[PDB]
CSV table of C-alpha atoms and ligand atoms in Angstrom, one decimal:
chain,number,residue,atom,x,y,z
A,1,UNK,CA,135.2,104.6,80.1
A,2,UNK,CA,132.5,107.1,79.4
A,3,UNK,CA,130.1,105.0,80.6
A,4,UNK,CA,131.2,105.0,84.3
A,5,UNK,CA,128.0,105.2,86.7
A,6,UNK,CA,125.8,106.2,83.7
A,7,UNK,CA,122.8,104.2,85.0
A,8,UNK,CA,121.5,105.2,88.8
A,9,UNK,CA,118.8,103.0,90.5
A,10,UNK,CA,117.1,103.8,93.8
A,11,UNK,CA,114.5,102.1,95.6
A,12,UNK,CA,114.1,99.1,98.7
A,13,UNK,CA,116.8,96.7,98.7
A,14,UNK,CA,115.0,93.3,100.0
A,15,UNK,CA,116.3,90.3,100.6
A,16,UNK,CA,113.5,87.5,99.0
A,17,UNK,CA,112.3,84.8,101.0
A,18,UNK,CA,110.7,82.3,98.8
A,19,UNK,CA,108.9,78.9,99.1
A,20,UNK,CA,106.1,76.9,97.5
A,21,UNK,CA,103.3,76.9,100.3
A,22,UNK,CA,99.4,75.4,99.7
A,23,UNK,CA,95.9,77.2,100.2
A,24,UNK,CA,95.8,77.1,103.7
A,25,UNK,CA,99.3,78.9,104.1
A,26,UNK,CA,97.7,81.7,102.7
A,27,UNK,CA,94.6,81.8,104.2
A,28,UNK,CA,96.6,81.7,107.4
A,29,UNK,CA,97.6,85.3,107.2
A,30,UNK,CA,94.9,86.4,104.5
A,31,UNK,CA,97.0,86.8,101.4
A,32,UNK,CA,95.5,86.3,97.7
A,33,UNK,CA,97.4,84.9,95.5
A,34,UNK,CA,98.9,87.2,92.4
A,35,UNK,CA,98.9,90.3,94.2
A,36,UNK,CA,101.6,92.4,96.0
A,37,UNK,CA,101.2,94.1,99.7
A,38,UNK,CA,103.2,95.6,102.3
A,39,UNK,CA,103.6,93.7,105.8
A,40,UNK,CA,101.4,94.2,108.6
A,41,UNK,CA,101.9,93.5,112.2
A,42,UNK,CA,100.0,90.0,111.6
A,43,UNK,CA,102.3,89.2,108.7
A,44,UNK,CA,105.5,89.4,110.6
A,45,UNK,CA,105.3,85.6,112.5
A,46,UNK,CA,105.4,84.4,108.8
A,47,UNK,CA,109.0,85.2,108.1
A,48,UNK,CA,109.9,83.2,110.5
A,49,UNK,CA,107.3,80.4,109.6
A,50,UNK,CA,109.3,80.4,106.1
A,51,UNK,CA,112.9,80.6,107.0
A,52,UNK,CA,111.9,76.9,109.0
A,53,UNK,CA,111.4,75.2,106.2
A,54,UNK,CA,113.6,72.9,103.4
A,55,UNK,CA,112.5,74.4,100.6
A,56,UNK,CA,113.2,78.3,101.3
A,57,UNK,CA,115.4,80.0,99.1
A,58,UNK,CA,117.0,83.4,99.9
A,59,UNK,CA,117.7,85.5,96.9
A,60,UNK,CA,118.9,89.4,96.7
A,61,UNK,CA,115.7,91.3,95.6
A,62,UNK,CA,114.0,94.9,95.4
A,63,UNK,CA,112.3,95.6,92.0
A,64,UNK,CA,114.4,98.6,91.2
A,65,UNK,CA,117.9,96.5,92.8
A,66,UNK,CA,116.7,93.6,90.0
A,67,UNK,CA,116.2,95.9,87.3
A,68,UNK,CA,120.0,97.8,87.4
A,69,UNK,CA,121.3,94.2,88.2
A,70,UNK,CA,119.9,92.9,85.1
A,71,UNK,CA,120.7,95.9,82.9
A,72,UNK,CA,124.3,96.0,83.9
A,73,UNK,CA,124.6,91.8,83.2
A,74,UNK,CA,123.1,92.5,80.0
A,75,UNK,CA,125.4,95.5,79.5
A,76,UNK,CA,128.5,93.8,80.0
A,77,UNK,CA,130.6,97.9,80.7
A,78,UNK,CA,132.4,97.2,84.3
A,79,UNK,CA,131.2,100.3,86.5
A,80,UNK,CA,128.2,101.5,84.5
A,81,UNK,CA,125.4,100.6,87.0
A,82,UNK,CA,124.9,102.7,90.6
A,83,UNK,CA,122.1,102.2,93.1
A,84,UNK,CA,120.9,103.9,96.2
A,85,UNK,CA,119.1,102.5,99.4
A,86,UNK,CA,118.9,101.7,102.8
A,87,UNK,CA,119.7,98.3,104.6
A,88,UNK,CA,120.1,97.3,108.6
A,89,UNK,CA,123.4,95.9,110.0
A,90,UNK,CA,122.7,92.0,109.9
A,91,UNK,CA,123.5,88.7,108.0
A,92,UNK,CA,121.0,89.9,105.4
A,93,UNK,CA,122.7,93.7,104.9
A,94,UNK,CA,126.0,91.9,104.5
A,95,UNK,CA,124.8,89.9,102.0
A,96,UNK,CA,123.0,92.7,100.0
A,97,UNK,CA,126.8,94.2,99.9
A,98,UNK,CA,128.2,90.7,99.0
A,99,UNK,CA,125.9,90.3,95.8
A,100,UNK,CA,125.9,94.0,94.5
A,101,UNK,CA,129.9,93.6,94.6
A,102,UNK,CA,129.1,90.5,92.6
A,103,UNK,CA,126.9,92.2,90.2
A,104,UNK,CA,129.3,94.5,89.3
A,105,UNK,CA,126.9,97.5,90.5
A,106,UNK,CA,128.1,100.6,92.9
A,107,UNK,CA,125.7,100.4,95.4
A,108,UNK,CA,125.9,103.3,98.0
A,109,UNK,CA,123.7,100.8,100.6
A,110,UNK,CA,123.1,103.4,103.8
A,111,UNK,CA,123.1,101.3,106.7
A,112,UNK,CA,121.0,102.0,109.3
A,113,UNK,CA,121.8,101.6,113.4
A,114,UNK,CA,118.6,100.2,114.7
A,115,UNK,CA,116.6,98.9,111.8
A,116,UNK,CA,116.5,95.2,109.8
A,117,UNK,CA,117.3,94.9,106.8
A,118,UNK,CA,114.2,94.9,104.4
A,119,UNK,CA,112.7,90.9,103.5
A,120,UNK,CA,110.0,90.3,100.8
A,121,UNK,CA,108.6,87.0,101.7
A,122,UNK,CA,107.8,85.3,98.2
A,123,UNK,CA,104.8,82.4,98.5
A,124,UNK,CA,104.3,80.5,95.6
A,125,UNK,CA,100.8,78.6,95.1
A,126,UNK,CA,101.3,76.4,91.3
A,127,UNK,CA,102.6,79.7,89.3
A,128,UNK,CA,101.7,82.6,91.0
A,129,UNK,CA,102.7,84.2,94.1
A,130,UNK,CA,102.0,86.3,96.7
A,131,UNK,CA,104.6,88.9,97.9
A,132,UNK,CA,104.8,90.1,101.6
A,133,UNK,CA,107.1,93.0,102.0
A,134,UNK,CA,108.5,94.1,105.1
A,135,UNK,CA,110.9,97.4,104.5
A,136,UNK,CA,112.1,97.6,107.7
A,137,UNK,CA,115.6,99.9,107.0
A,138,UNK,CA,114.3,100.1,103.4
A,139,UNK,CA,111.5,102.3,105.0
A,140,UNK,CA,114.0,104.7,106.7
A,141,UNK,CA,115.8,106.4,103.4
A,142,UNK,CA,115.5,110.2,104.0
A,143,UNK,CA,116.1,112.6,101.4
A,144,UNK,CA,118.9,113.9,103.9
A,145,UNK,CA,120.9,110.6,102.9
A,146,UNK,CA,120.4,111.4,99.0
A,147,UNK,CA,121.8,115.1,99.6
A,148,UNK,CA,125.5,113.4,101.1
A,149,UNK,CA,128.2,114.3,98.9
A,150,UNK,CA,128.8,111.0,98.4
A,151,UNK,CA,125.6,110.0,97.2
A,152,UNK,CA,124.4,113.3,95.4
A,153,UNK,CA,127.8,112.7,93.2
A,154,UNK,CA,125.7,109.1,91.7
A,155,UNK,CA,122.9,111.7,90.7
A,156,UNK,CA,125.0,114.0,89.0
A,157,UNK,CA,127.3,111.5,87.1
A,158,UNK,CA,124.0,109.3,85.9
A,159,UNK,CA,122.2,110.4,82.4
A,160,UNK,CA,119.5,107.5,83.3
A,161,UNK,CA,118.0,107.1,86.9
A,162,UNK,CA,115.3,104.3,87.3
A,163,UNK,CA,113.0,104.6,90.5
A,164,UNK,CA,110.3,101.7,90.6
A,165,UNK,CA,106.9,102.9,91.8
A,166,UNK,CA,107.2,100.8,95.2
A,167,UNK,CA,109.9,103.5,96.2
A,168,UNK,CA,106.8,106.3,96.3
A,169,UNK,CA,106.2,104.7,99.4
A,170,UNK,CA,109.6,105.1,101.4
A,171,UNK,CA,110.1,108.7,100.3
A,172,UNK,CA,108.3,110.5,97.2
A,173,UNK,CA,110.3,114.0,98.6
A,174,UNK,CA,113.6,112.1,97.8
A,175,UNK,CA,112.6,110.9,94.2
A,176,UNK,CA,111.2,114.4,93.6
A,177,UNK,CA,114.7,115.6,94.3
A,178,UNK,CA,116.1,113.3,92.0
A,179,UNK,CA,113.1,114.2,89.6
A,180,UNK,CA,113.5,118.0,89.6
A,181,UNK,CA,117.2,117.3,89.2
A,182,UNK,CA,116.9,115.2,85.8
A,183,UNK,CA,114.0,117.7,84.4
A,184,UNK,CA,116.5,121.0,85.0
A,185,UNK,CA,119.8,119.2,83.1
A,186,UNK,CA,118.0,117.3,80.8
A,187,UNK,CA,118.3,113.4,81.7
A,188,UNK,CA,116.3,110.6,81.2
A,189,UNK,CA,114.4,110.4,84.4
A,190,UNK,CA,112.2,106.6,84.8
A,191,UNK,CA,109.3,104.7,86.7
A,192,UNK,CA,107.8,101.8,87.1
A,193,UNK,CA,103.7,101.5,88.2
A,194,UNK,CA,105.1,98.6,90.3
A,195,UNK,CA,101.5,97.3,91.6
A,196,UNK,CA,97.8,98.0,91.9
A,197,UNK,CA,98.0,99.7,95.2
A,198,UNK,CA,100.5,101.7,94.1
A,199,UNK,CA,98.3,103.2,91.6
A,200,UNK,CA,95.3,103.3,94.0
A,201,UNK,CA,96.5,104.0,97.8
A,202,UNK,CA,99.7,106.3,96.4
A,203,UNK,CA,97.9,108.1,94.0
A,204,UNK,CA,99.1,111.9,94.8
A,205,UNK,CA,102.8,110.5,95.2
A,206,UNK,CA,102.5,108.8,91.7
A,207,UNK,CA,100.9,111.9,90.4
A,208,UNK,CA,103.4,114.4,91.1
A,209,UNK,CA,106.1,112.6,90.1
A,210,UNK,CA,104.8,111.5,87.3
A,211,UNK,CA,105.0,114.6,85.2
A,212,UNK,CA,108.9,114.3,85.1
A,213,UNK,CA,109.1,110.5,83.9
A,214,UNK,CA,110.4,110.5,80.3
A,215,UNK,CA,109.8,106.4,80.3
A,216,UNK,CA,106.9,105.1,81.9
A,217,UNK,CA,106.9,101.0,82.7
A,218,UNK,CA,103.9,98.5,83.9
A,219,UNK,CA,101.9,95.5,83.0
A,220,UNK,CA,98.5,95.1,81.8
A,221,UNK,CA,96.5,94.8,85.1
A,222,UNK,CA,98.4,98.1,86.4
A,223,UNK,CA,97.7,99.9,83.1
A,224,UNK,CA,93.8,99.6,83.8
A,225,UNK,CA,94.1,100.2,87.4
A,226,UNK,CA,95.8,103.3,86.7
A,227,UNK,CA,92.7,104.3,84.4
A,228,UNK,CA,90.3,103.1,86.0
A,229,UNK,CA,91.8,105.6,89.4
A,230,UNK,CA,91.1,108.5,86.8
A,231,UNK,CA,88.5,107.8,85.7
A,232,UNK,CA,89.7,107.1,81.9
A,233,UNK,CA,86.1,104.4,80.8
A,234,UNK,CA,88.4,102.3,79.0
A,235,UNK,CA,90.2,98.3,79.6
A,236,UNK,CA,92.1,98.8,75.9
A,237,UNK,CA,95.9,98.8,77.1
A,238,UNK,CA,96.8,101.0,73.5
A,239,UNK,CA,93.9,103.7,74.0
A,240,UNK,CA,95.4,103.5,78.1
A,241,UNK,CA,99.5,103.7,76.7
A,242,UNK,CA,98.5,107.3,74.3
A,243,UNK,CA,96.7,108.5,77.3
A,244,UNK,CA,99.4,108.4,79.7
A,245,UNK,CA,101.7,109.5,77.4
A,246,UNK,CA,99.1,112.9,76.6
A,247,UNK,CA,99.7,113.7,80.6
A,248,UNK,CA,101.1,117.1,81.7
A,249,UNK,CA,105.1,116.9,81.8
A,250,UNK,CA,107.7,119.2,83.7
A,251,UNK,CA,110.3,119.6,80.9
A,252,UNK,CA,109.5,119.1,77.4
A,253,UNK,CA,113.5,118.6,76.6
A,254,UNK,CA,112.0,114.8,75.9
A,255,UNK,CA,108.5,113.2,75.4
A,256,UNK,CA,107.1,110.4,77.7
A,257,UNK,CA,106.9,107.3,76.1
A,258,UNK,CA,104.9,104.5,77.7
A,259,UNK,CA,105.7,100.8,77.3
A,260,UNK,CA,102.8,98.3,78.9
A,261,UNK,CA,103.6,94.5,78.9
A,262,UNK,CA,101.1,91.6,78.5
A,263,UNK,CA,102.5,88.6,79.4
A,264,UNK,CA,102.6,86.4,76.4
A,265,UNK,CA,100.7,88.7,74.3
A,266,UNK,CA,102.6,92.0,71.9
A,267,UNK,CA,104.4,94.8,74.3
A,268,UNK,CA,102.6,98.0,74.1
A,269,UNK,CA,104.0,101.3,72.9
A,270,UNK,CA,103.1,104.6,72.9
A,271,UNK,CA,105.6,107.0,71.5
A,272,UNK,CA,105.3,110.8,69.6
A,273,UNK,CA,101.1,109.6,69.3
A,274,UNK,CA,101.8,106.2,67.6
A,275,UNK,CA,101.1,102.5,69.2
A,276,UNK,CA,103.9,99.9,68.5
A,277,UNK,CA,103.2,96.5,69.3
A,278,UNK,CA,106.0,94.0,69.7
A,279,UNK,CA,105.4,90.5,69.6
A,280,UNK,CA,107.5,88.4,72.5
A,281,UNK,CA,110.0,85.6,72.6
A,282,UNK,CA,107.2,82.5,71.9
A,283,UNK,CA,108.0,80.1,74.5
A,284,UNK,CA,106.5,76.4,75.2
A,285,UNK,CA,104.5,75.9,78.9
A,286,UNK,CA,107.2,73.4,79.6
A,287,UNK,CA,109.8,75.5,79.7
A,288,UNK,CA,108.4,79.0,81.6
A,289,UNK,CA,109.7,77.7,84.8
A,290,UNK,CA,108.4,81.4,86.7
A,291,UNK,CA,107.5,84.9,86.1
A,292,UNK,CA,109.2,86.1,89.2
A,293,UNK,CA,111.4,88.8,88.3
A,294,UNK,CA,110.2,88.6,84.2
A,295,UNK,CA,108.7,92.9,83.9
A,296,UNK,CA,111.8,93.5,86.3
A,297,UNK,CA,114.3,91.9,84.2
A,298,UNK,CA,112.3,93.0,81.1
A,299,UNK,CA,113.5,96.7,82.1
A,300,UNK,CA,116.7,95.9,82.8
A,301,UNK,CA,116.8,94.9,78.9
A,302,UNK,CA,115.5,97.7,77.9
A,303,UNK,CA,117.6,100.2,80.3
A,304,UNK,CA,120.8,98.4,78.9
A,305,UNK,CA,119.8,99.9,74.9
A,306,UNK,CA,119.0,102.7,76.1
A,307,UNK,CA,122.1,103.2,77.7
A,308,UNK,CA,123.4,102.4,74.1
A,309,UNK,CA,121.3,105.0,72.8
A,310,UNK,CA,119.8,102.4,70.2
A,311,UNK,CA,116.3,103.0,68.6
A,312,UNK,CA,113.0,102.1,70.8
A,313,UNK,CA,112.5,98.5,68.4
A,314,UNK,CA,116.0,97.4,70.1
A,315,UNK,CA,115.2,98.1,73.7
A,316,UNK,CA,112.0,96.3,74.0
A,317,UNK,CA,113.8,93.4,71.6
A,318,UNK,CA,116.5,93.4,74.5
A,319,UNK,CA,113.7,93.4,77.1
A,320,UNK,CA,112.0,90.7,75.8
A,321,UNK,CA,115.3,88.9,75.6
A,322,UNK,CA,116.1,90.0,79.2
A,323,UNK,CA,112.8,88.8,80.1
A,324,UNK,CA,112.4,85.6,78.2
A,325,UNK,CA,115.9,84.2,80.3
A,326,UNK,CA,115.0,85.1,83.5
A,327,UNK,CA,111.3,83.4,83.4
A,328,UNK,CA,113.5,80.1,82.2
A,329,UNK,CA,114.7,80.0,85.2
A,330,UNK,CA,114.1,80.3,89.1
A,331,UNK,CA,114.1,83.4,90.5
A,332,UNK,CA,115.4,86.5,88.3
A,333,UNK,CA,118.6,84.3,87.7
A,334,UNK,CA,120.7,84.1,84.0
A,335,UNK,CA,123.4,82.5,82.8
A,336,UNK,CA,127.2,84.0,83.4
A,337,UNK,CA,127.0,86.1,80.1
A,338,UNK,CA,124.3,87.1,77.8
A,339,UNK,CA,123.8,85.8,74.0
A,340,UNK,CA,121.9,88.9,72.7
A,341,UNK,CA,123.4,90.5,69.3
B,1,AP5,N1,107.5,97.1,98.3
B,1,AP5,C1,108.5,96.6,97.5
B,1,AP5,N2,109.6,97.4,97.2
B,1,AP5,C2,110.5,96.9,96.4
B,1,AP5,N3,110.6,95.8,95.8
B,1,AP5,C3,109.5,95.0,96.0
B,1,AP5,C4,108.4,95.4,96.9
B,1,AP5,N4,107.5,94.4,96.9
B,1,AP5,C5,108.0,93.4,96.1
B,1,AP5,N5,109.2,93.8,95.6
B,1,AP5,C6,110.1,92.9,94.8
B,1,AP5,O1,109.4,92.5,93.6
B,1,AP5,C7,110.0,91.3,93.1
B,1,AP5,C8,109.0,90.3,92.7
B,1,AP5,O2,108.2,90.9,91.7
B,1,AP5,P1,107.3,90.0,90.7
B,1,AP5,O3,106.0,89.7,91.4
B,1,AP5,O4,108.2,88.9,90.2
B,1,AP5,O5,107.1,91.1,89.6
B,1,AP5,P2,107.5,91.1,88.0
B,1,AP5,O6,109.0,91.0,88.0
B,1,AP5,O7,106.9,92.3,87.4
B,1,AP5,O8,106.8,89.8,87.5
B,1,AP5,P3,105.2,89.6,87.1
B,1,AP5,O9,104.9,88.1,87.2
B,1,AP5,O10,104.4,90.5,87.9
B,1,AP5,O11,105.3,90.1,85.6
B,1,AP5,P4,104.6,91.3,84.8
B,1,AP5,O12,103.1,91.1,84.9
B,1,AP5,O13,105.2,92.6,85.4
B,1,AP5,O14,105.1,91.0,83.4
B,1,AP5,P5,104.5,90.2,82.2
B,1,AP5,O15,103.9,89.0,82.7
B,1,AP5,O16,103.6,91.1,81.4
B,1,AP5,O17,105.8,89.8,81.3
B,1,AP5,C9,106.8,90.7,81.1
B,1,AP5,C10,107.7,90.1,79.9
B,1,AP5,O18,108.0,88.8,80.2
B,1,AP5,C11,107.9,88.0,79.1
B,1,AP5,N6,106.9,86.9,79.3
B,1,AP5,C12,106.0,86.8,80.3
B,1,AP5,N7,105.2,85.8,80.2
B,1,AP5,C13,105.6,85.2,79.0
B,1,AP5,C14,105.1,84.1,78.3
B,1,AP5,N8,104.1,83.3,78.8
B,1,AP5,N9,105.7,83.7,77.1
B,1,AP5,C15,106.7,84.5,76.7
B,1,AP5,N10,107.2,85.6,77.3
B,1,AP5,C16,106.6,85.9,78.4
B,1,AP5,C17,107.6,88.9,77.9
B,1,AP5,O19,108.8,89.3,77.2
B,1,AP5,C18,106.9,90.1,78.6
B,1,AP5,O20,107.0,91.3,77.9
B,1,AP5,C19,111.0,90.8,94.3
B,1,AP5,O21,112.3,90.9,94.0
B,1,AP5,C20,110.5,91.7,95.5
B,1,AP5,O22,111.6,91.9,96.4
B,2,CL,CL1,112.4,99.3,94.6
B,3,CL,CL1,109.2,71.8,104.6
């Protein structure tokens, strides 16, 4: 098929330890609720405070692992997904292997001799949680690993690579490789802003790659933290979407086109200077089970369009479809197939 490994994703595969905790679970280890971190050496008891309980759930994670998985179930094309990372030899590691098989994605895992495999610990106060995440092996991808032959082959065969903005963290040198490598045989290179302290601690990471994204992702409260960082006096997510857009690229084979989410309110646009707003899938209090895994699985729907090469009104329709499942239900879960046409 001509769509063999098409799509490449790289980033921190994590394996998502989630349970509903109360207040004083996270004031134990001073996390606030509805914001993302990386583990410290006082958050590592924790894990092990979580696996002992009944109501843990363990669930194959990473935000740029959830994204390909959801684009290629949406897809549907055997083989057209590939992703990259770094996982320990464990229980955990095996089971990363055992779901990507299961996905239907070709995930090149590097497996590393000493280190963990990577754990997000997911705790969930009402509707909002707090995420915890310890790379461990994640942490150890070197742009040596990226360079094998067998890897480097994923890089060239893609037209699409998606890199969420957590992976700036691990190793900005290799997703400049990839980056320069997209910009000089004109391919659709992608990010995510991922989190707030993405956009404020990894600012120069961000920044240089930045210029060679062709499809910029993020919600509302990443939006303004990535304008208020420089120094743009504006909270309008539109006037913020142009002006991200208007930055300096590396190739100008394509243009950058920004697409910010806002929860139940119209997806944001910005595309050749012109703001399209999309409104979203309505959908009753009753039913919106979680928002774990909903701007992950909203790019995954759009990925799979794109893929398609379908006009920009289609991809963030198929991300809102995408999106609209997966917050249905636990977890970024769906059903066996999809229903979108
Ligand atoms: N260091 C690290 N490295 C790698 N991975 C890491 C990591 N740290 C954490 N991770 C991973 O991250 C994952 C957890 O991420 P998670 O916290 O679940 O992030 P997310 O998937 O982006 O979900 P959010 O709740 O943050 O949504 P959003 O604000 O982005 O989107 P919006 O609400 O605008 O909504 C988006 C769309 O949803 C739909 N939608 C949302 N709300 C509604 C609504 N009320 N009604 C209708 N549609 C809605 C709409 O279509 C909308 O456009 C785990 O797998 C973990 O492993
Ligand atoms: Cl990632
Ligand atoms: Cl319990």
């Amino acid at each position: 098929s001509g769509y063999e490994g098409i799509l490449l994703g790289m980033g921190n595969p994590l394996l998502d330890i989630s349970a509903v905790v109360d207040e004083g679970f996270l004031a134990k280890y001073d996390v606030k609720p509805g914001n993302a971190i990386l583990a410290e050496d006082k958050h590592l008891p924790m894990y092990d405070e979580l696996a002992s309980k009944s109501n843990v759930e363990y669930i194959a994670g990473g935000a740029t692992q959830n994204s390909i998985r959801v684009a290629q179930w949406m897809l549907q094309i055997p083989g057209a997904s590939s992703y990259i990372g770094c996982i320990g030899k464990d229980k955990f590691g095996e089971e990363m292997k055992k779901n990507a098989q299961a996905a239907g994605i070709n995930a090149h895992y590097h497996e590393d001799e000493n280190a963990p495999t990577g754990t997000c610990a997911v705790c969930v106060v009402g509707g909002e949680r707090s995420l915890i995440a310890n790379l461990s092996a994640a942490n150890c991808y070197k742009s040596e690993h990226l360079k094998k032959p067998e890897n480097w082959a994923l890089v060239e065969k893609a037209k699409y690579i998606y890199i969420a903005g957590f992976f700036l963290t691990v190793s900005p040198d290799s997703i400049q490789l990839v980056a320069e490598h997209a910009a000089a045989t004109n391919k659709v290179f992608m990010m995510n802003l991922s989190a707030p302290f993405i956009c404020e601690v990894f600012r120069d990471a961000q920044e240089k790659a930045l210029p060679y994204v062709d499809y910029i992702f993020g919600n509302e409260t990443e939006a303004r933290t990535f304008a208020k960082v420089r120094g743009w006096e504006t909270e309008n997510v539109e006037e913020i979407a142009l002006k991200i857009s208007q930055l300096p690229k590396a190739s100008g084979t394509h243009k950058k086109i920004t697409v910010i989410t806002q929860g139940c309110d119209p997806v944001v646009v910005a595309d050749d200077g012109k703001v399209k707003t999309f409104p979203v899938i309505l959908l009753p209090k009753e039913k919106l089970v979680d928002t774990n895994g909903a701007g992950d699985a909203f790019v995954g729907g759009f990925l799979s369009q794109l893929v398609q090469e379908k006009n920009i009104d289609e991809c963030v329709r198929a991300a809102c479809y995408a999106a609209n499942v997966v917050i249905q239900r636990s977890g970024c879960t769906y059903p066996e197939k999809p229903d979108f046409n």
